[PDB]
């Protein structure tokens, strides 16, 4: 099956009073492989809402109900979104005009994303006072997930941070009074019973090294993504621009090579007698190492010359930050540690001097 197909003006989720649809589609809000997101007029309450229509596939439908399961809990504990996660108002199944069945989630009216904010400013650096406000509210959301709910997000990234329209201005620039919302809990997970997983999670640019290495990931995988997000706001640019595992790990090595410790260490050799998902990942990760060292640049093999220049342009972490922003460098250093066991809890990072 495929995605939903809509024209502006048609209605979603028909009911007895509105057989054409309770939610009148107003404008597109965003989309992706998961489905589509439309701004809608709730004909019942006569309020602005956002409806996320999920592509009629059980890969995405199962993720969607996982997101419903999480947002139901977050909404009950934190109804006014004190902890800045997106508020889900409703959920229903929309039987397509064409035949497919679509789960849809109803949300508070959504503003543009943090990625949208960056792109529209030509990926110019985000001012530190505004970066601080975004980081604090984001860290409050992550604290709410990890410690108040034992949930790991696994996909912290600028696209998954939305600006509340009230904080947004018609001149399309955010101040330090901006309010954010952490969104997209379909790839989230509950670690209350099984706290260590080995599935490949997170989008590539924000993926923590332990996910690539197969040593087992947990809540700390979100802190690394947070730290890469912060750097991205400070420079305007995506930190790790690579899709190859070996080169990606070397970019980590190059960036953190002057933070002492901080070296890419291979995972323990797995059982040859194990068809586990952990062993398979560690089996593939150990091919990127020769004798306990990351096999870069010899492991790329032409291309070894392109990887050498790309890694050479990768800046060292200290070099990125201006002298008057040493405190923000210190905060990020407790985030971008290669060993996940040295990363701080989000509650500890909220007490970091950068936030006072
Ligand atoms: Zn300081």
From TrEMBL:
Species assigned in the record: Cyanidioschyzon merolae (strain NIES-3377 / 10D)
UniProt-annotated binding residues for Ca(2+): 155, 184
Domain annotation Protein kinase: ranges: 23-355
Leader sequence segment: none
Binding site for ATP: 59
Name of the protein described by the UniProt record: LAMMER-like dual specificity kinase
UniProt feature coiled coil, ranges: none
Lineage, highest ranks first: Eukaryota, Rhodophyta, Bangiophyceae, Cyanidiales, Cyanidiaceae
Phosphothreonine PTM sites in chain numbering: 238
